């Protein structure tokens, strides 16, 4: 259960790791230009992701407008905190990556299980949060382009599997699936 | 003025003269019932009823109109049947509750107040109608005999002699003479109570009484020779 996020100069790259064998886990499309990736407890984490998708979709239908990624991230933070009020906290980690059409700039946000929101150039959770910062911090640059980012992700993922993913990109063209890790 | 058109179609409404006509109408329902009287004696009280027999099909022993709210309380009402029996059961509940809590029979003045509040509570809101029964009740307690008579308005007082029903004016007039003539023993009143009912009046005579001396404070009916003696006196 690894989720990654890289904020390149014109897009956001989200990656996720996959009894029952198949041939889109830990992700939900909140909006055409917004993507949400989550990791944590099975079950308690998907209902929250499904609920968030409904509310954001409901807002889009009601207003016929694309809610900005910053607003979406704030909404998730309040709902996650509101969820924990009357129950014991549950291990959840959400990455919200979206392209702000109004500002024409990508954005990536990280939300912890306690409901704290961080705007990040890059982020990770799980086993990827122990060493991968040593690589991204050394190699990441602000003006990195999409094609460069996936070399970094392909590089990064390579270290992850040495010490040991489905990849999506959000851009002005919308969500996009990728086979080149 | 006895109709009060305009202010009489709803309960809990004051007429320009301050009267609540719905309560007054409930009084008229009382005046159509069988006359019932209650006599307060030096040692107890006496109740009499002109039960108008309707048909032979009624079971004589189970057709009793002088209700017993509690072992030491006798109750007789005139007016609407549903309200009279509804009030008796509610009064029966209060008597049991008081005994349950304080482990003593409920005093008559306290019992009357509890009924008065319930009856009066139905004159406050338009969703309910005032009870259409004037209830004569009494008994014996630590302070002696008590006879009370609550109206549909919820007003009740202690009485030396009470009367209700259609045969009310005649019974009250004769009842006043009895008090004036003998200002009674539990024995004597039973004969006098029978006399008043016959004067007031096919009807049968039902009589009950409760006295400290002749019934050690319990309420019992009049039967057998005593009954016949009262009829003979009447």
């Amino acid at each position: 259960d690894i989720i990654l996020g890289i904020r390149v100069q014109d897009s956001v790259i989200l990656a996720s790791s996959k009894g029952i064998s198949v041939l889109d886990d830990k992700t939900r499309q909140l909006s055409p230009h917004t993507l949400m990736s989550f990791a944590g407890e099975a079950g308690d984490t998907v209902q929250f992701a499904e609920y968030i998708q409904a509310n954001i979709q409901l807002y889009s239908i009601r207003e016929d407008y694309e809610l900005s990624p910053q607003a979406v991230s704030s909404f998730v933070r309040q709902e996650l905190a509101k969820s924990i009020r009357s129950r014991r906290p549950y291990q959840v980690n959400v990455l919200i990556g979206g392209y702000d059409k109004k500002k024409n700039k990508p954005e990536l946000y990280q939300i912890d299980y306690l409901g704290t929101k961080v705007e990040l150039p890059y982020g990770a959770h799980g086993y990827s949060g122990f060493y991968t910062f040593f690589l991204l911090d050394h190699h990441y640059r602000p003006d990195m382009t999409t094609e460069e980012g996936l070399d970094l992700l392909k590089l990064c993922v390579q270290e992850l599997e040495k010490r040991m993913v489905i990849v999506k990109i959000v851009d002005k063209d919308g969500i996009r699936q990728v086979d080149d890790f | 003025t006895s109709i009060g058109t305009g202010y009489d179609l709803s309960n809990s409404v004051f007429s320009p003269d301050g009267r609540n006509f719905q309560v007054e109408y409930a009084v008229k329902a009382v005046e159509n019932g069988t006359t019932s009287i209650g006599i307060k004696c030096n040692d107890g009280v006496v109740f009499a009823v002109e039960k108008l027999i309707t048909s032979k099909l009624l079971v004589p022993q189970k057709n009793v109109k002088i209700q017993v709210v509690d072992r030491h309380i006798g109750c007789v009402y005139s007016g609407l049947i549903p309200d009279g029996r509804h009030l008796v059961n509610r009064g029966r509940e209060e008597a049991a509750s008081f005994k349950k809590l304080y482990k003593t029979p409920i005093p008559i003045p306290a019992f009357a107040d509890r009924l008065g509040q319930y009856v009066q509570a139905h004159t406050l809101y338009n969703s309910v109608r005032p009870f259409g029964v004037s209830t004569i009740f009494g008994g014996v307690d630590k302070n002696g005999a008590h006879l009370y008579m609550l109206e549909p308005s919820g007003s009740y007082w202690g009485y030396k002699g009470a009367a209700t029903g259609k045969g009310r004016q005649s019974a009250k007039a004769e009842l006043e003479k009895l008090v004036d003539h003998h200002p009674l023993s539990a024995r004597e009143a039973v004969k006098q109570a029978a006399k008043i009912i016959y004067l007031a009046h096919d009807f049968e005579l039902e009589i009950s009484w409760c006295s400290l001396s002749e019934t050690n404070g319990l309420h019992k009916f009049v039967k057998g020779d005593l009954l016949q003696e009262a009829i003979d006196f009447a």
């Binding site: - | 809590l101 304080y102 482990k103 005093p107 306290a110």
Partner: protein, 202 residues
Amino acid sequence: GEVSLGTSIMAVTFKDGVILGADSRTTTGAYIANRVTDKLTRVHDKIWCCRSGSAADTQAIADIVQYHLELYTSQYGTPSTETAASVFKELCYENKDNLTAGIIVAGYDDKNKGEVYTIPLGGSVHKLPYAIAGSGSTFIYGYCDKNFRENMSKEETVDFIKHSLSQAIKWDGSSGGVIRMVVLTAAGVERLIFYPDEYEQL
């Protein structure tokens, strides 16, 4: 951290009334928070309550009983000591799972003269000619039985209570101070106070 009432309390019916007596010391552990406490609580003019166990629950219950009795008094006149005990039982019993209350009720009424009702922590009600409760009562159970007599006079009962509580005070340090006593009689409520210099040497 709840404050438990360290007490040595006693009620004794006598010829023409009842006497309620108690110490004046309340302790938190080994410390004496107050040594002039008035443990004799009035629930009615002729009915007086005394509390054992937790000081919070009993104080709350005592206020309710006084409220209910005042409510009863306005309707059916002055209540009996039996009625007050009944009120205590309802509160003490139905809340036994939450309230830790032990009570002694002593009162005077025309119908029953003096009466004493003791309500241990279990919530049961027991009518007795005399009653003793509190931590210091465990040390005089064998003295009150040997010396108590029925239909005693005021002087004997006052002396009897003085001797009884002097020993409980002597052996129990949770109880001590001044012996405050209430004499309930048809003449009226009377208050007595005995200082240590008056009863210790007995």
